[PDB]
Amino acid sequence: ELPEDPRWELPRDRLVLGKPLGEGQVVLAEAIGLDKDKPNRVTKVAVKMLKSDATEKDLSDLISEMEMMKMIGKHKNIINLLGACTQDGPLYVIVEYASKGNLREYLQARRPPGLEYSYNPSEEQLSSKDLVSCAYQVARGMEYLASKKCIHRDLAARNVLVTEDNVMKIADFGLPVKWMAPEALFDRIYTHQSDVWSFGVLLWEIFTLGGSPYPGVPVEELFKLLKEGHRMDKPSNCTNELYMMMRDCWHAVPSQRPTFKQLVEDLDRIVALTSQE
Numbered sequence: 001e002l003p004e005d006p007r008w009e010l011p012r013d014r015l016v017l018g019k020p021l022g023e024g025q026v027v028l029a030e031a032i033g034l035d036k037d038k039p040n041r042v043t044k045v046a047v048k049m050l051k052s053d054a055t056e057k058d059l060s061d062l063i064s065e066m067e068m069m070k071m072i073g074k075h076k077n078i079i080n081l082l083g084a085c086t087q088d089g090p091l092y093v094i095v096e097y098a099s100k101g102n103l104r105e106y107l108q109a110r111r112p113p114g115l116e117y118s119y120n121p122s123e124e125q126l127s128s129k130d131l132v133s134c135a136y137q138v139a140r141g142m143e144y145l146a147s148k149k150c151i152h153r154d155l156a157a158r159n160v161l162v163t164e165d166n167v168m169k170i171a172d173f174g175l176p177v178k179w180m181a182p183e184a185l186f187d188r189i190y191t192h193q194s195d196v197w198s199f200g201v202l203l204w205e206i207f208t209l210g211g212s213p214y215p216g217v218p219v220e221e222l223f224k225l226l227k228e229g230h231r232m233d234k235p236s237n238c239t240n241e242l243y244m245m246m247r248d249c250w251h252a253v254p255s256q257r258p259t260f261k262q263l264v265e266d267l268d269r270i271v272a273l274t275s276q277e
């Protein structure tokens with residue numbers, strides 16, 4: 001029995017459940033009067049709830065996700081908590097809707113069709129500057145979360161969502177081996193520094209327009225290969241400077257990786273110098 005929290009509570013009648021977005025389960029919905037000072041406006045939102053066949057660990061995880069989202073607060077580049085329906089029936093956690101889906105899918109749909117190398121499984125191509133701008137927005141979100149002492153633990157382009165206005169939003173930050181820092185694979189030590197590693201894999205995903213990391217490398221081998229100083233090759237269409245940044249994020253010594261603060265400052269600069277092509 002969840003306790004009431006009138007900071008977040010939305011009467012269930014104010015919510016109109018629409019179509020599934022993916023499977024907890026997430027469904028599109030329309031929310032009437034989220035804003036106290038605009039009670040006759042409807043907003044599109046995503047609603048996370050348990051599946052039919054759920055347990056009581058699945059519930060306690062859903063509740064802890066919600067509680068962490070209330071603590072972390074709002075930022076443009078994270079999926080923000082908007083509300084909750086907790087009392088009059090099954091738990092609904094209401095969050096921002098991102099109409100263009102996850103980043104992996106978004107980039108894939110925008111591949112040039114003629115690349116035998118990486119087919120388009122589906123939109124307008126992304127310029128060089130737009131791709132860098134994507135990386136910058138993800139780094140800003142992660143900079144905010146780290147400032148709030150949140151360790152993501154599964155940062156990847158599949159865990160970034162894209163809004164109607166092409167805003168990148170970190171998802172699932174309040175709750176796979178190919179994104180994990182060596183020290184996370186082995187010693188299960190998760191830090192802001194391991195999140196930086198994951199961000200490097202995510203940069204690589206960006207500049208390969210949603211490629212699969214370590215292609216053809218069996219998971220079983222990966223720790224050994226990384227300990228021996230194996231890193232992914234530069235993506236064909238990536239500048240040497242952005243590759244340097246990737247490689248820095250993949251420093252073996254965690255203390256030697258850049259912070260999200262530095263990454264944001266470096267990407268801010270790169271975006272401004274990046275072109276038309």
Ligand SMILES: C=CC(=O)N1CC[C@H](n2nc(C#Cc3cc(OC)cc(OC)c3)c3c(N)ncnc32)C1
Nearest residue numbers: 021022026046048079096097098101102158171172
């Ligand atoms: C990996 C992709 C994936 O699962 N997708 C892509 C579309 C779909 N989806 N999944 C979505 C979600 C979600 C979500 C739900 C949450 O509930 C607590 C928390 C969270 O991160 C803070 C994100 C979502 C959304 N917010 N807006 C639009 N589409 C959404 C499911």
